[model samples]
Target: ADAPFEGRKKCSSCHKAQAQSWKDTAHAKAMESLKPNVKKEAKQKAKLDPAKDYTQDKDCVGCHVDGFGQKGGYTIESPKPMLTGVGCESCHGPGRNFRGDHRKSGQAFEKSGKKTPRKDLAKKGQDFHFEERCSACHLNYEGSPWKGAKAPYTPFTPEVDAKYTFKFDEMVKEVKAMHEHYKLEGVFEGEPKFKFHDEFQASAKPAK
Candidate 1:
């Protein structure tokens, strides 16, 4: 209802460590690399002009950048660097609605300190439609031009599957690696604090 676009730089102000880590990830550079990767030969092989068409072409930019048509997204005329690539908000959703709004009671992340900030704005909790959020871009949609396809944006059918396949469960876990060292409730930290997890692990299991 009250989602304001605070931009990712504001996120860096408080989430220092995570923000730095994010700066190195592929998502951070997702946009800037768009034009160059589109090879003329590859474009022709796939059904494009293959000569000069690139990022400026709406077909390509639609996926390469974030917030393409929507508010706070990207456009050719005036680009928003903070919102350029596959930004934090792309996955976590807008931050202001839960984190930055001083006017709000709850916050997504806490400001360096004492105790827990157990509040969820999206779908009322820490996580929302996580995979669904990812699949919006990852999935091979049908009856759609940009459906997940081969080099030319073509869908991989069973014929292609007979040749190769990909992982899903591993992806869910791998995505965690995309994020940086985040906070946990009961206010945990790097070393000795989380030692309990390793210390009590084998013993904590039930006798079932």
Candidate 2:
């Protein structure tokens, strides 16, 4: 959670091509879109204060940054490296425990040479990758109490959020059918309906 890409520079060292390509992607701008100064206009219109109030807002940071250290407030003094934008660590788990081994092994890319997966990296957590990881911030879930009041804070659920959320096995079967139907290009005709898609799309989509 602590790992953020920081900047494309660090990623370029290893993932040269990927870093180069991603620099132009929306993912690269995901964090910038959340900065207080950058989003000032929207924040003011919405009456949001990032430094004080926004620090408590999970909806804002869940996608913008990584490793929210504490609940309800952002810790500004934490290591800058930990503040990296959505990055390898967010999906991979904190690298502090694995970075050393990762770098020491020349064959690190080989699955047999890598360290045993952490609990969070288990197959069960694949669902987290497919759903919970993105939904944590994207979907409107309950937030901590605001102002320490006992009353519940109203939840914010938007219609757009529902469309992006997905079920794992359903997505898998749908993807598999697509792969089987169109192996080289992996493309399928017809409307992109997840539920009624081909069996390949449902059964063979790669697991997260």
The most accurate candidate by lDDT is 1
TM-score of each: 0.60, 0.45
Clashes of each: 2, 17
Superposed Cα deviation of residue 64, candidate 2 (Å): 1.0
Which residue runs does candidate 2 get wrong by more than 4 Å? 1-12, 36-59, 70-74, 79-82, 107-130, 140-157, 160-208
Query: Mind giving the per-residue lDDT tens digits that candidate 1 earns over 90-205?
Result: 66666655563322332422554443333434422222335544555554344333344433332333233433122444454454346544433334223222223333334332
Question: lDDT score, residue 112, model 2?
Answer: 50
Residue ranges of candidate 1 with Cα displaced over 4 Å: 2-4, 37-53, 101-120, 123-127, 143-168, 175-177, 183-208
In the range 65-164, model 2's lDDT, one tens digit per residue, is: 5555533212344424334455544444444434444344325435354433333223222112333444444443344222232222213333223434
lDDT of 1 at 160: 37
